[PDB]
């Protein structure tokens, strides 16, 4: 079976805001990737090996709202640009890639999986360049090898004239390293 | 929810259709030049290509289009009318070998279905099964390029 994904919104502006403050979220969680929001921005967070990882330049040092109130980060690595909270009860984790495949697939916030060719330790070329706005909101999303395993987490886009031609990502290795730190 | 593949049927046989690029494609040997039903009446084919065994009407309701493959992968996956996924190794522009040959009945009625790459993008439309002694070993398919060109 090929990589296919879908999305579902679980709450709107107002519920989001109340929950941001309250820090108590009672919604049931399902899925490998969570669509996350702060009062300033929305992005993604991927659950890999029981840990809900996301991009530091988005989550900052914040806590994640949960059924038991705010949950403090398990890992925070300003330099690796990573943060990770214990994966939410009900989520499903992906596992790291063990095949060094250089044919990756970026799963965007809109549940679209677009191919990117690995061209370095933290880069890949979009076989079909897309405008920046489309990639907006996908930070912290996974880059999967053909088998469906986490190779990395989308961090930034390499673009010009407003079109993303490449992507910069946090390799799944920095996660291991960050946990070990 | 919206489906990319529609399960259609005529007076005799039943087969599949796939929406790609806003068009609902299928096999000419299933539909022919026939019109497609709608709550407002039958709507005609926007495309008909007896030669490539290809025909397409404007995508129906409850459907969502599939994206053409851009990665050029040969590790294809066929989707049947029962939603079964069958890994197929691409042997050629219109041919692929099932990784596990299956009895013809298993691929029966699935013509017009999609042939996906490892990213779920459309690579081609299942044209016909190539079976030896009642066993589908490989399959014939219309690449998306023909469709991209046809439209």
């Amino acid at each position: 079976a090929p990589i296919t994904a879908y999305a579902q919104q679980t709450r709107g502006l107002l519920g989001c805001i109340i929950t941001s403050l309250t820090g108590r979220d009672k919604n049931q969680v399902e899925g490998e990737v969570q669509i996350v929001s702060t009062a300033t921005q929305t992005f993604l967070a991927t659950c890999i090996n029981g840990v809900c990882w996301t991009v530091y330049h988005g989550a900052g040092t914040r806590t994640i709202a949960s059924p038991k109130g705010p949950v403090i980060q398990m890992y925070t690595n300003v330099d690796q640009d990573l943060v990770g909270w214990p994966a939410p009860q009900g989520s499903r984790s992906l596992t790291p890639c063990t095949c060094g495949s250089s044919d990756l697939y970026l799963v965007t916030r809109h549940a679209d999986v677009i191919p990117v060719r690995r061209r370095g330790d933290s880069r890949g070329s979009l076989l079909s360049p897309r405008p920046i706005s489309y990639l907006k909101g996908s930070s912290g999303g996974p880059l999967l090898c053909p088998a469906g395993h986490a190779v990395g987490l989308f961090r930034a886009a390499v673009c010009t004239r407003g079109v993303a031609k490449a992507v910069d990502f946090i390799p799944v290795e920095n996660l291991e390293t960050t946990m070990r730190s | 929810v919206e489906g990319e593949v529609q399960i259609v049927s005529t007076a005799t046989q039943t087969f599949l259709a796939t929406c790609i690029n806003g068009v609902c494609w299928t096999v000419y040997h299933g539909a022919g030049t026939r019109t497609i039903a709608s709550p407002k009446g039958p709507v005609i084919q926007m495309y008909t290509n007896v030669d490539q065994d290809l025909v397409g009407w404007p995508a129906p309701q409850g459907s969502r289009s599939l994206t053409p493959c851009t990665c050029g992968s040969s590790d294809l996956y066929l989707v049947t009318r029962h939603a079964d996924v069958i890994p197929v190794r691409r042997r050629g522009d219109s041919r692929g070998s099932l990784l596990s040959p299956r009895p013809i009945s298993y691929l029966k009625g699935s013509s017009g279905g999609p042939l996906l790459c490892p990213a779920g993008h459309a690579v081609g439309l299942f044209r016909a099964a190539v079976c030896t002694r009642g066993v589908a070993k490989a399959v014939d398919f219309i690449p998306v390029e023909n469709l991209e060109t046809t439209m």
Partner: peptide
């Protein structure tokens, strides 16, 4: 700063399925 709030999910584990009739 408030907590990061989950406003949605993306599910990869799903497989082709015939949409049930209601």
């Amino acid at each position: 700063k408030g907590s990061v709030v989950i406003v949605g999910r993306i599910v990869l584990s799903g497989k082709p399925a015939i949409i049930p009739k209601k």
